[PDB]
């Protein structure tokens, strides 16, 4: 407005020739494009010596242009629906479809109670054949007792695993902790199971958008990483996923103390990527001491090897099996995946990269890799190829 | 219903064309639109159930050539026959086991022209997500791939750019809507940023500024850029600014300046960049001109 | 898929989406199978070539310069195969291989030789 101020003063208006007029609205038009928020290209606009100093069409396309250069739109969200009822069938067959639009838990309880109020029981849980649950808990879920019970948990649970894998971390929460509430009363093994399912889900929102910028986990996460990787409960029914998930939290977080010396043995014995996991923290914390990383890097060093040695006629990648390590190949590409902590990262390329060299390329780390190995005939190289390809390209992925 | 359905394996677009005619004599309408409804709900039971072996609807295996049409029907925008081949459209992306539904949202993204048409576009996204996944890179990765080819015509490129600048800045535009919708177009334009760079510097000019724009708001991928795509987006940039700034003046310029802009604010090795080649490019026989 | 295709042929017309997509994928093998698949599917069934050419450009326009060295091996077949669209095909293996530095230029001399008896002598 001083602007202004300073342009109505020292214009002299209708009494200065035509091109001091025709500068004076260029400046004002220019000034005007290069604001950013719109009430003040209002402003100027609204103010008398721009509506006086040009014409009408041309201010009115100068509004028009600034009004459309950061437009707003509405969009409908809510899914079409050519629905009004005529009969039982035809009300079965739109609440089916509402059930199978819906996400939010309440709404499907009472989908679910109405549907069941008009039916015998008929088991709506296979209303839709895209409601994966996962086979570990087939039997746990369809042994519940109660047809409404089961319905429910079956589709609360299909819904926030699909919602989780769609990244609708907020949807998959209701409709996860509205089955942990249902299920607290019926099981204890349901309820076991549905918090692990809470706990996977928390890795993977905290894993989205609430982390990537280095902000450290709630700790009470932390804590039930641990005690999920700690439980030893032989009776519940389990994913291996999500103990994959938990390594790759604790390494991708740092918690290398944890792993180094709080975990116990039997599930090192038991579980893969928990021993992996502890030569990886073991192996990067080690680094600056020579002798102490050597141990460590002779470990994790042999034991993928054993991973990329095939058993002594079909390959490796075209067998998935015959290999002597404590899980395939792919298991490990797909669980190293899940890791971003560039230092954890650069320590597998620098071990697969070596196993390259041996049978150049250069890496931060090589020094540390012993290049005499046993079993030279059964690591199979073509393997170690595709890994180390597709490995440098996931960490490229991370970080270019 | 059950005949359409379960038999109907031949030219039933045809069949469907002349069904939803008569729902556009009086009591033969009323019957045909509600007969038209219990087939789409005839259809729904048949698609979603039993869950493991498929069924097989020889009505939607009809219907899966003529998508296209399909699309273009739909954004006719009647009273409720847009409704009705909307809902088909759903199913039929359902139906399709190489899941055809990208492929109708991009026929539905490089039509629309009214925003009304891109909440048809988000509707059926909206009705898909429930089901399927990973729609929005797969629709944007085919509409691009066929921008890129000869096919997908320049008008239907510069809408498929300007529909797509909608709905990424709607969705940076917070509210209600993107957080009920969760589609994830920033995220997702994100991974083609190198395929957009090129339509910016098209000979059409409308398919230039509308690139412009979409890649001035649309965010860089969720860690950073790599030297080779930040690179080409600086150059693509500046020679946008210059040509834009040589075409419609300063009025025509704000998309290419804000690209930069953020590009800049990326990196001290895009800000560097951004001025080396800026300047350069101002100081080039050509472009001198302008100043 | 591979070995029924060689007992039945025209089974690939079903898969031509998937391996669309598995044809610009960056592993070698994969996306090499994929590419020969592609070619037996649409030499079987000359009519289903132009849908592929999309995704056959993108390979060519790919960043991965594996994806275009397979798709530039492929070209000749694939021009062949297509005729119609040979033009734009074989102008845009020209343009990445002079702007890359790739030389197409026996894939694209063979390619021109065969299209060249197919049209004018």
């Known amino acids: 407005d001083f602007l202004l101020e300073v342009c109505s003063r020292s214009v002299n208006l209708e009494k200065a020739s035509e091109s001091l007029k025709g500068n004076m609205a260029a400046f004002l038009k220019n000034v005007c494009l290069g604001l950013e928020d719109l009430q003040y290209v209002f402003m100027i606009s609204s103010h008398e010596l721009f509506i006086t100093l040009l014409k009408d069409e041309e201010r009115k396309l100068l509004v028009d242009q600034m009004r459309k250069r950061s437009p707003r739109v509405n969009l409908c969200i809510k899914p079409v629906t050519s629905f009004y009822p005529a009969s039982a069938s035809v009300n079965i067959g739109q609440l089916e479809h509402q059930l199978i639009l819906s996400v939010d838990p309440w709404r499907i309880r009472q989908i679910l109670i109405e549907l069941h109020g008009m039916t015998s029981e008929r088991q709506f849980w296979t209303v839709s054949n895209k409601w994966e649950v996962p086979s570990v808990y087939s039997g746990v879920i369809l042994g519940i007792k109660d047809n409404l019970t089961r319905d429910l948990v079956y589709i609360l649970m299909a819904k926030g695993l699909h919602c989780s894998t769609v990244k609708d971390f907020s949807h998959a929460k209701q409709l996860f902790a509205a089955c942990l509430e249902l299920v607290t009363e019926f099981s204890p093994k349901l309820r076991q199971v549905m918090l692990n399912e809470m706990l996977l889900l928390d890795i993977h929102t905290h894993e989205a958008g609430t982390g990537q910028a280095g902000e450290r986990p709630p700790s009470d996460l932390i804590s039930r990483v641990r005690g999920y990787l700690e439980m030893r409960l032989p009776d519940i029914p389990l994913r291996q996923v999500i103990a994959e998930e938990c390594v790759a939290f604790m390494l991708n977080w740092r918690e290398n103390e944890y792993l180094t010396l709080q975990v116990p043995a039997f599930l090192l014995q038991s579980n893969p990527y928990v021993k992996l996991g502890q030569l990886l923290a073991a192996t990067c914390k080690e680094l600056p001491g020579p002798k102490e990383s050597r141990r460590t890097a002779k470990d994790l060093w042999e034991v993928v090897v054993q991973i990329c040695s095939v058993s002594s006629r079909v390959s490796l990648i075209k067998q998935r099996e015959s290999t002597l390590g404590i899980m395939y190949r792919s298991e490990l590409l797909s669980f190293i995946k899940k890791l971003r902590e560039p230092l954890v990262l650069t320590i597998i390329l620098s071990l697969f990269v070596k196993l390259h060299n041996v049978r150049d390329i250069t890496a931060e780390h090589i020094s540390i890799w012993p290049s005499s190995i046993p079993n030279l005939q059964s690591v199979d190289f073509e393997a170690v190829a595709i890994t180390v390809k597709e490995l440098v390209r996931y960490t490229l992925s991370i970080n270019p | 219903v059950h005949l359409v359905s379960q038999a109907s394996g031949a030219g039933a677009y045809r069949l469907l064309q002349f069904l939803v005619d008569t729902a556009m004599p009086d009591t033969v309408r009323e019957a045909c639109d509600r007969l038209i409804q219990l087939l789409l709900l005839h259809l729904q039971k048949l698609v979603h159930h039993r869950g493991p072996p498929p069924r097989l609807v020889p009505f939607l295996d009809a219907l899966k050539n003529h998508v296209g049409e399909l699309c273009g029907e739909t954004l006719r925008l009647e009273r409720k026959r847009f409704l009705w081949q909307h809902q088909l459209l759903g199913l039929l992306s359902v139906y399709t086991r190489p899941s055809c539904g990208p492929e109708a949202l991009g026929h539905l993204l490089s039509r629309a022209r009214s925003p009304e048409e891109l909440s048809l576009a988000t509707q059926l996204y909206a009705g898909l997500v429930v089901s399927l996944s990973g729609l929005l890179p797969l629709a944007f990765r085919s509409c691009l791939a066929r921008v890129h080819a000869g096919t997908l015509q320049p008008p239907f490129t510069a809408r498929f750019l300007r529909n797509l600048a909608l709905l990424v800045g709607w969705e940076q535009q917070g509210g209600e809507g993107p957080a009920a919708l969760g589609a994830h177009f920033g995220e997702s334009a994100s991974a083609h940023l190198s395929d957009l760079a090129p339509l910016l510097l098209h000979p059409e000019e409308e398919v230039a500024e509308a690139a412009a724009s979409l890649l001035a708001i649309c965010p860089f991928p969720s860690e950073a850029l790599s030297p080779s795509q930040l690179l080409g987006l600086v150059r693509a940039g500046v020679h946008r600014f210059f040509a834009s700034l040589r075409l419609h003046g300063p009025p025509g310029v704000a998309s290419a300046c804000q690209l930069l802009t953020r590009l800049s604010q990326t990196s001290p090795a895009g800000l560097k960049a951004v001025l080396q080649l800026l300047v350069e490019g101002a100081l080039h026989r050509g472009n001198t001109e302008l100043f | ?121």
């Not at chain 3, 960056?26 to 590419?35: D, V």
């Not at chain 3, 000359?46 to 070209?75: H, K, W």
């Not at chain 3, 297509?82 to 102008?91: K, Y």
Request: charged share 15%; net charge negative.
């Open chain 3, 1 to 121: 898929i591979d070995e029924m295709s060689r007992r039945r042929p025209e089974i690939l017309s079903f898969f031509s989406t998937n391996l669309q997509r598995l044809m610009s994928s960056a592993e070698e093998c994969c996306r090499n199978l994929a590419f020969s698949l592609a070619l037996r599917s649409m030499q079987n069934s000359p009519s289903i070539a132009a849908a592929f050419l999309p995704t056959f450009m993108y390979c060519l326009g790919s960043q991965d310069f594996e994806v275009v060295q397979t798709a530039l091996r492929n070209l000749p077949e694939y021009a062949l195969l297509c005729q119609e669209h040979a033009a734009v095909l074989l102008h845009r293996a020209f343009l990445v291989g002079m702007y890359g530095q790739m030389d197409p230029s026996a894939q694209i001399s063979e390619a021109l030789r065969i299209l060249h008896m197919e049209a004018v002598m």
